[model samples]
Target: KDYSLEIDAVMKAAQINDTNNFVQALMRWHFSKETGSPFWLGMREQLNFDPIKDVKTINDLRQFSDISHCLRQEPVANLVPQGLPADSHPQVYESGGAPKYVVAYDAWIEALISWRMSGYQHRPGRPSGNTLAAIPTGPHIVGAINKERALRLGGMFFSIDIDPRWVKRSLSEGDTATVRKYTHHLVDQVQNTLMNQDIRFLVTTPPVLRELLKRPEVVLQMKQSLAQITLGGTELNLDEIKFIASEILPDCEFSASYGSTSALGVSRSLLITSESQQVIYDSFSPFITYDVVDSITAQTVEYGERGNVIVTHLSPWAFYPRVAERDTAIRLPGVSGFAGDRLADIEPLK
Candidate 1:
């Protein structure tokens, strides 16, 4: 398949200015019988019109049935494209199909290689360029994607472990000592990795980054090597973002992404632009799309209005429908060639 064309088409759709047409094209490419994902195949019968024709714009995508229910179960093998032969085994990221379907190992490696050369800076001793360092937290899809991105950029990655389940268990059991120990151990791991490995980029959540910042030793160790920080998971408030960007690591670049297991991949934010104290998360179009709608009425909200965030992910690897995200934000017009709402004031459930 002409993957480049497909990728370019999706990027173009995002740049087209019309949200409806952009969304429609996203659905068509992600749901097409020839190149669409397996998740959309099962839901094809429910669509209101021919995606190729009816979905001539982003707004027209609302007609298709929201199919986000596919994320709750296992055995995702069914989601793999039929075009890939049975023998064309793809390396499974989640063993029993626990929802997230990453690009198989071979595909991931190839993508990483391609991304490295895609020219996002960070090429061997380049001045003031950003790079990526991947850390695989269990059951999280960040590792593979980060690894591939890093490989493509000629950067290094440092894998780390932070078991949320264990932390929860410890908190539930009131094992304060154990929790403290684990936290310290985690910092030590980062310090050691930073000292030994030639890592300059990091992909982690706000909480983890916060924990690292609290440690003087760890902070000192992290100063020279790390150049960029990509935060995700829960929202990083303005105070926190400013601290990280200015006080903590003034020299490093900071970006945030918002995504879920259902979306297959992430939506990245544009680099520092405004100082509105709002966190605006941008969607990676064609591969993914987002709409902010009124919670009670289920209709799209006016720009700069707060409401429920609805997302759709279309890929040959998988397809997802109008899944409601836990976070809420205002919808702003697009920037940087991405045509969709910009998510502001991101938050997480307590």
Candidate 2:
């Protein structure tokens, strides 16, 4: 209880949308020599601005220079905060296709998962069937995210291990035939799980889900068995996703996670109200914030406007500031008092 005093305080503030204070508390915790990661403190020697003195607010964190890109090669242990207990094991995850790595504390994982599931309409422990996750578990955080949800929800999780490196390599080499067959193999695995098991929830990427639905039997099975769906990886068109949620899976709950690997965790998809056509994703702000900026100008686009997406993540476990993501989105207004910009209709950059 005493250990989480700072963490709990920030989470509590986050629960109430009081993220400004959370930002202050977090910046101090991550940048402080006594409490922050040695990786950050080590970088201070070369940094032009002092984090303690110059980075008082979340916005000011932009001054810390951006994501060094060296995270792709740095040792993981050095990224652990000095304040964490020696026994607390930090986990490492490699970015999807980028040869980059991010280290996360177990404490931060709990914080991330707890807040994320809370935002869902049909949360974990909703007393339903098993979960089939067809997403990448080898080096992806979604693997961790869904597995936890499945166990906590009182159901078994069926995993289809994905090798993103192979997938990307295959795609880049114009080996679509191989990639397609392998992807079909993944869908077949999910088909077996759904056919034989009491699968209540399905967590998969847009492409995988689409492939599964190509077979009428899988579509029928999902409508009859699953209670919810969580889609991520690539962004889907709004009209198509709406057709999925509103027509095909009308009774089942659906949500999207808008994020990148460097950000560590993802923003949760909000319930589709009249105002939001494309699914709107709310960030776990202060800890993770998204900014939509003009592709050419690199300045923030106006509300309801489209731009390139920039992500920043701050936590005791890891800190990745001002990392440009591979996608773009229309900037939406933050709900209530949330400080970070909400994102909608996310699309890949050519």
Candidate 3:
């Protein structure tokens, strides 16, 4: 009960869109002795400055070093704040590989994704049907995202497992044969599912999406029933997007989600327009933000300049500030009232 008022305020602010004092409120919520997590509370003693005192603004979050790698080893119980109510049983989500576990205490990330997806349902010519996700399941966040999307949109959620670790390991060892085999294996699952189900919406990575495009029967099945496709993972490029939009799936509405495991939320992709034809991503501001920075200096680059991406995730559920991701992108100015920079042409660091 001691921290309930502060917790309630955060919830109310999120609901009412009155978030001008949000950062401050969250600082107090996460730093106060009564409510702070065991991880943060212990970490505070080692820190040079006070989080509750110094981290009153967004920029102040930079004071904390990139401690994202530490998440891999931190006990999950210690990561959760003591302030959350008894009913708030946070589920764990993990990154691929050794795994950086995070607490999914609230529906903030999912709500943002669902809101963006549901908007397409009301748009003219956008596909509206069941969702089929060929994305990672256990511990990975997108599994929950797709399931919630299916529930909110009123349809069955079909799925196939994706082991990113397996593909990455094979690639690292120069095993293209194994990689190809694994990808084709996934496409085969997708083929079987689509043949049986009325799945109109598809969520998957570029590799699987590309493989599906090669098969005539799979293409026909998608052309007949598929109305929308939302691709994740940053493997696809502008030319590929253009090819997909024009050459294949011309009748379908194409979209994407750009995100990282550490950030825990995704940047929403803009609808591909005839004039722009660029896959620009705008994030859920205040909660999740992006800053394209110089690879060497770490200073923010000028708008339209390409640089490394720094993602910051802030929510009552979790706070992973200023994680310098391996991806690079062109920094575009974000929406006037939004809190983060827009990203374009995002790809692996070259």
Candidate 4:
């Protein structure tokens, strides 16, 4: 069976333009015993319903139970599909909380880079610029993913160490003093890079972005040259967004990426500019599909209703379906370009 054309389509953003066909193709690719990975093939006995038969549409993915827990328990090697190069070891990344795992393929990374860079116009400097990243590193996806972006932007990547686990660990133990010290330490580290490096792009969280804006020297550097600020890792409220847009670096263009390592990737929020504003994250649909549903009953909420985010990661190289997420969001209507439930006003569910 010549799968050249079919395989090509699956790799190209899961044929998102024709998503119904893409979802069907993915269900067929992953469920087929011959081509599927051992991890999901073994799950044949576990699934209450057959994926090949039941998952006809995107919404039908809810049939499977959230298997995010099993990622920690299962051997990482079992999850990789046989079609990939045997020598290319899959890269592993973890969630910010409690360290759930996901294996990423090199092909997927290239595809993802192409897709991500597709949106941004690169530096005209011919590899003469740099970016300062203030997010988590060491076993985190943000580190690996942003380094790739920073490099591709024809810029040098400068960063500081952020151990989220240690911070979460400290907070759990009532070590407020340590957390306070670490917070300020991160800002100062970023300042050192901003002051020293020819940095033009900054990628940091809301907390760090908030602190950096308050610091005169850092804000001065941004006003002098920082072109854009790509904020992630934490959700920022509208008041904060408005304040930054008005008071801090008003000349710079800023975007917040609503991503999760758990979902395997983030969505570029819907680009709707209204006097009314909201961050609408449209996932790389068909492969990384989001279903915002009633948290207790698992029913999808109507347009503009907030609910628990239930995610499904389905691709040829990896399989993590209908994985529950801790995020609560407003489910905006799907758009034509990306055919999935658009996410908005995302915040961590307390």
What lDDT score belongs to each candidate, Candidate 1 first?
Answer: 0.61, 0.77, 0.79, 0.74
Backbone clashes, each candidate = 10, 1, 0, 2
- Model 2 weakest 10-residue run by lDDT: 118-127
Residues 1-350, candidate 3, lDDT per residue (tens digit)? 66667766886765564555777888877777888788887887888888877876666777877778888889999988888887778888987477688888555655666555656667665445688888888888778767777766668888886787888999999999999999899998988899888997888878888888888888888888887788887776667876787788887777788867787776778866455556798887777788899988889999988899999877777778889898998999887465678998788887
Tens digit per residue, CA lDDT, model 4, 1-350: 45556678776646446666777878778767766778888888778888887777776776778777787768887777765555558898887466577788666655556666665655353323688888887778777777777877787888898888988899889999998898888888988888887788888877777888887877888898787777774466666766776677776766777776776776665432334388767776666778888877878899899999888777666767777787899998777566568888888887
Per-residue lDDT over 201-240 for candidate 1, one digit per residue giving the tens place of the 0 to 100 score: 7776665677778878767766886777778765577776
- TM for every model, in the order presented, reads 0.76, 0.91, 0.93, 0.90
Residue ranges of candidate 1 with Cα displaced over 4 Å: 1-39, 46-53, 72-74, 84-119, 122-134, 165-181, 272-276, 336-338
- Residue-level error in angstroms, candidate 1, position 230: 2.3
Q: Residue 14 in model 3: shift from native, Å?
A: 4.4
Residue runs of model 3 more than 4 Å from their true location after superposition: 2-5, 12-20, 121-127
Candidate of highest lDDT = 3
lDDT of predicted model 2: 0.77
The residue pairs in collision within model 1 are 19-58, 20-57, 20-58, 20-59, 21-57, 21-58, 22-58, 23-58, 116-152, 116-153
